[PDB]
Design a protein around this ligand. Structure first.
Ligand SMILES: *[C@@H]1O[C@H](CO)[C@@H](O[C@@H]2O[C@H](CO)[C@@H](O[C@@H]3O[C@H](CO)[C@@H](O)[C@H](O)[C@@H]3O)[C@H](O)[C@H]2NC(C)=O)[C@H](O)[C@H]1NC(C)=O
Ligand SMILES: *[C@@H]1O[C@H](CO[C@@H]2O[C@@H](C)[C@@H](O)[C@@H](O)[C@@H]2O)[C@@H](O[C@@H]2O[C@H](CO)[C@@H](O)[C@H](O)[C@H]2NC(C)=O)[C@H](O)[C@H]1NC(C)=O
Ligand SMILES: *[C@@H]1O[C@H](CO)[C@@H](O)[C@H](O)[C@H]1NC(C)=O
Lengths: 49, 99
């Protein structure tokens, strides 16, 4: 080669996503007392989430 | 006897005595045999002439019509679900902050 060129290029990368939290009783029962008292003889499927 | 329950005015009803309306409080309510829990406040969601209640996208009741005084009300949950507790170790101290 006898001459050259300067080239500027672009690269795009994800770094992070959104952070969420879920309330187990409010999603399942929803301020019911008949429910959320039946959802107490089920196991620990709400701390593990 | 064959009966149906759907979004329309009630014709024949059971022998239960009505009571007073309590607003802006967490109460159980029974409107025309439709039971629920929550806070009753006034609203503006104008209904159809026959419509008794209206649901939302999650298929949960959102607004209801008072049977005796034909006035719309709406229902919001009793639970606030965005509270977080900043604490040092419970060993060191028993003080917290709330967000
Ligand atoms: C290596 O390549 C570069 C281009 O990357 C050459 O630079 C270019 O030189 C030419 C001739 O001098 C310039 O043309 C001029 O254009 C202006 C109008 O823009 C005009 O008024 C002048 O009379 C002339 O025609 C050209 O623009 C210039 N390019 C850049 C970016 O500067 C360079 O000469 C090459 N070198 C070798 C060793 O071949
Ligand atoms: C449904 O009834 C309420 C209360 O009825 C009143 O008491 C009954 C025993 C009987 O005497 C009715 O004729 C009475 O109206 C009605 O609410 C009343 O509305 C009137 C205006 O028409 C008002 O002056 C009264 O103060 C209201 N009373 C109360 C306690 O709110 C209501 O209008 C009736 N619903 C219908 C079908 O419109
Ligand atoms: C709790 O506090 C005591 C008394 O200051 C200290 O001796 C102990 O190491 C602490 N334990 C923990 C788990 O922080």
């Amino acid at each position: 080669p006898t001459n050259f060129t300067i080239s500027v290029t672009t690269e795009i990368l994800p770094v992070s996503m959104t952070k969420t939290s879920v309330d187990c009783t409010m999603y399942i029962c929803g301020d019911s007392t008949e429910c959320s008292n039946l959802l107490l003889q089920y196991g620990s499927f709400c701390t593990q989430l | 006897l064959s009966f149906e329950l759907l979004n329309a005015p009630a014709t024949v009803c059971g022998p239960k005595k009505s009571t007073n309306l309590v607003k802006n409080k967490c109460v159980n309510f029974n409107f025309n045999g439709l039971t629920g829990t929550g806070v009753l406040t006034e609203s503006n969601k104008k209904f159809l002439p026959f419509q008794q209640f209206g649901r939302d996208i999650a298929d949960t009741t959102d607004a209801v019509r008072d049977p005796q005084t034909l006035e719309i009300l709406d229902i919001t949950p009793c639970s606030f679900g965005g509270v977080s507790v900043i604490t040092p170790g419970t060993n060191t101290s028993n003080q917290v902050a709330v967000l």
